[PDB]
Amino acid sequence: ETVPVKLKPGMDGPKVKQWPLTEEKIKALVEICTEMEKEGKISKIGPENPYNTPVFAIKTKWRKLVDFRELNKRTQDFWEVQLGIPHPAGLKKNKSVTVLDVGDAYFSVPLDEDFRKYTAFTIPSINNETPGIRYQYNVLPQGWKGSPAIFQSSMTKILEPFRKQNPDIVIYQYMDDLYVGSDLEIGQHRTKIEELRQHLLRWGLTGYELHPDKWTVQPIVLPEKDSWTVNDIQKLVGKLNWASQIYPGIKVRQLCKLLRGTKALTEVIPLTEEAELELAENREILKEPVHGVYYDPSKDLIAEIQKQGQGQWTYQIYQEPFKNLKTGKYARHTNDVKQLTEAVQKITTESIVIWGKTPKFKLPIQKETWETWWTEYWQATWIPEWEFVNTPPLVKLWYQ
Amino acid sequence: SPISPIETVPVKLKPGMDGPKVKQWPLTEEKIKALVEICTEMEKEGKISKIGPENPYNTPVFAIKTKWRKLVDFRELNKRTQDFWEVQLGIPHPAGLKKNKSVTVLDVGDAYFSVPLDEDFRKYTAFTIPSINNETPGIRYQYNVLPQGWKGSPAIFQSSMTKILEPFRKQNPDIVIYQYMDDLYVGSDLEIGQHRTKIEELRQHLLRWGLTTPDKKHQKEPPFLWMGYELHPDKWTVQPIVLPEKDSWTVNDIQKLVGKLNWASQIYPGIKVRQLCKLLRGTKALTEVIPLTEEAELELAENREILKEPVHGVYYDPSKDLIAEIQKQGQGQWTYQIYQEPFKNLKTGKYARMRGAHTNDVKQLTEAVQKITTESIVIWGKTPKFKLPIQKETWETWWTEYWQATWIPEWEFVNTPPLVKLWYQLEKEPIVGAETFYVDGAANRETKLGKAGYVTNRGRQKVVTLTDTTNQKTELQAIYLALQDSGLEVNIVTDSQYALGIIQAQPDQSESELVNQIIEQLIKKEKVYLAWVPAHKGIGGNEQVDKLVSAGIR
Ligand SMILES: NCc1cc(Cl)cc(Oc2c(Cl)ccc3c2nnn3Cc2[nH]nc3ncccc23)c1Cl
């Protein structure tokens, strides 16, 4: 018995263009889809289905990735409020969190007949030889936020003996993945994951290891200097001027005093003691969390990334600009696009662990280069929302 | 003519909408007679069927002229019919075609009329031949087949042709079949005999499903004229391009010239269109004569020379890699050629784009690489190997220091001048024994009057008044002043992120003449260090320029 799925009123299904795919990805998808069809998971469709969702291939085995971003936004009432999955606050406090792919579970649950048309996707051909190969889903699709929402009840039943036997193990389902946390020693943790895989293995379903307790802030670092130049104080005042827009209690009055008259940039200007007091007092505030900043569940999360050079990237997560919920850094035969996708995926997984939702990314790359290359390195089964931004020149050095 | 026994495509109207009920306008006797003759003939062929008066839907009919044709106005029905999936997401490019031993063109005869319409949807296609004047009830018909001018026809036909071709495709994987509108383009590497036989097997499989195709004597011979292209057995080209000789060029003639040159640009290398396009800038009428500028005349002449002798492209060999070569032509103009075997181009193209107001050759080159990469994935399903007029060192220096994630796939330097370079570079640290200029600009929002100036550590000073200005313009003007009065080495301190931002990206070309003047200065300089400070915080020299430029302004 299929659960009926109703779209958000006033808006209809997704009509998103399929991106050009290489020959190897097309052939990989044709092979996958021929197989799913024989198994009745998907069916070939007619032209009377005007809907479309993009499809991609990722990795040694090729796997299908359906971009349900638009369908998910259009079904938000269903998966978020109607059939919401509660996020545990304890997960971010665990010594180890193991991420397990549980997407194969969804293929055993039939999709509501009157919702299937909205899961439409096309396999394109090279040089437009043939019209695309069109399919729709007959079962809960991987990548659609409604799939874990519907499967919720079956997941609870599967995990019930395990949860009863392990009361201090946190299990969170987000999209196609299970997040399993414990404060156990690494060996005992890995032993309990194998036990859970055995439980999953009895219902069909078949890792990636995080350490959230070791996740720490990227404080705005103020230099430690032997001798300070006019240029160094100027760099320091701008950096402090901006940190004061986010942190309660920052002061620059004493440091600003030093900058009197029109001086040469290289002039070594001997420091004071009250200026030294400011530095140390600001340093103290900079290492601690931001006072008065709390996550609002009704608001979207934003992630900002800056290229810092030498394979280093900085990022900030916020809901209101300046108001940082989390800051961090990512460090690397790796290119900028490969480094950027790795950072996006790392920031998303931390965001899932901490808030139970993905951020919208502000990416310092050209829309087109990102659109051509992102899949070459993408490894997750989810895709966050993203925008293309032109990184302001000073945000970079203030986060350096 | 047959009507395919294929399964019908279920069609629906848009939710909350009923079929059309649009009144038939009284027709002339000659029009009524013409329609009656047309309709009785289509009814006998199975195309339409007579209906009772119980059906409340109606679409208007018209007839136009020794033969007459029936025009059905499906505008109302089309507005009420559901949306269909897009027919094709692109059109095949000749350069993506592989060379086959034999290829034949099969056009399907009376395509839409050869495929049935959803029985439950036929009622909405109802039309009336009016009787002479008001008088008596009209003759009523509904369609049994896909009507011409109906929304769903292109999609339903294509979908029907796909379901039909399916079993034939499975049992013949070494046969290429292109689906284009009501045509089939069929290619194989079999010797004449078994190709002619496979064509007959195809034709016969098609007739079993209601579709008629031409036979050996009626089927077209190469070169195939198709979509402005010429497809020969060993090469392809664009159809003849004739650039008119005119005494006076109108907007319409220039627009037609640009379209022709753009079309030729796919296979003829070096085609330029920048100077011809510039003429189309402004509020100018279709028939308004535009005098050709010197540059437009020069560009026209260069193009006539390129087009003088015929140029062809070759077909794709899937075993070889694709090589893409790019050259800088000038004023934001780039040109490229794609080949597999040195100098036998599969295709050519051009790139010219203003991606912002301020740019450089390094950014333009990456934009052209991305545009070519996209195109290769569409045409060939693979990215090409690039040969670029930029040194690995220039690229490495640029990618490393730029704020944006930028990447070029597998490439090699090729010494084809003009080479792509960075014209200047900003210092990383303040210069010792160089004058520090503190710059500022201020502009009054009501009067649009502004001031640009500088105070130095060497006690120097200047203030210039500006008339129809903006804060941004004054801040850039202030940087220009400092650059003009400094000599070989400078340290500049601005409170403008906007100005800092532009200069840091190392532009070499701009839409702003002021930015171009700043550029021509930066190039001349030996060393420039540019720094930023927050405004109105009482910072050193910044507070001093602020008072100077603010006087009589803010
Ligand atoms: N209707 C245009 C048309 C458009 C499209 Cl997009 C495809 C078409 O059909 C071809 C096929 Cl099926 C295969 C190779 C082709 C084709 N066309 N050119 N070449 C390369 C080629 N190989 N061998 C040839 N022999 C003769 C002519 C071209 C030849 C046709 Cl005719």
UniProtKB/Swiss-Prot annotation, chain B:
**Consequence of changing residue 67 to S:** Confers resistance to didanosine and stavudine
Q: Tell me what the record says results from residue 178 to C.
A: Confers multi-NNRTI resistance
Effect noted on mutating residue 55 to D = Confers resistance to stavudine
Mutating residue 85 to G leads to what result?
Answer: Confers resistance to pyrophosphate analog PFA
Name the coiled-coil region(s).
none
The residues annotated as site (Essential for RT p66/p51 heterodimerization) are 398, 411
Mutagenesis / variant outcome for changing residue 135 to K: Confers resistance to emivirine
Effect of changing residue 235 to T: reported as:
Confers resistance to atevirdine and zidovudine
- Substitution effect: residue 53 to R: Confers resistance to stavudine
The UniProt record lists the Reverse transcriptase domain at: 45-231
Q: Mutating residue 185 to L: effect?
A: Confers resistance to efavirenz
- Which residue ranges are recorded for the region named RT 'primer grip'? 224-232
Substitution effect: residue 280 to I: Confers resistance to delavirdine, efavirenz and nevirapine
Effect after changing residue 330 to E: Confers resistance to abacavir, lamivudine and zidovudine
> Changing residue 63 to V: reported impact?
Confers multi-NRTI resistance
**Binding residues annotated for Mg(2+) 2, in chain numbering:** 440, 475, 495, 546
Site residues by UniProt (Cleavage): 437-438
Indicate the impact reported for residue 186 to I.
Confers resistance to HBY 097
Effect after changing residue 205 to Y? Confers resistance to lamivudine, pyrophosphate analog PFA and zidovudine
- What quaternary structure, including any partners, is listed in this protein's UniProt entry? Heterodimer of p66 RT and p51 RT (RT p66/p51). Heterodimerization of RT is essential for DNA polymerase activity. The overall folding of the subdomains is similar in p66 RT and p51 RT but the spatial arrangements of the subdomains are dramatically different.
Entry domain remark: RT is structured in five subdomains: finger, palm, thumb, connection and RNase H. Within the palm subdomain, the 'primer grip' region is thought to be involved in the positioning of the primer terminus for accommodating the incoming nucleotide. The RNase H domain stabilizes the association of RT with primer-template.
The miscellaneous annotation reads: Error-prone enzyme that lacks a proof-reading function. High mutations rate is a direct consequence of this characteristic. RT also displays frequent template switching leading to high recombination rate. Recombination mostly occurs between homologous regions of the two copackaged RNA genomes. If these two RNA molecules derive from different viral strains, reverse transcription will give rise to highly recombinated proviral DNAs.
Name the chain's protein. Reverse transcriptase/ribonuclease H
* Species whose genome carries this gene: Human immunodeficiency virus type 1 group M subtype B (isolate HXB2)
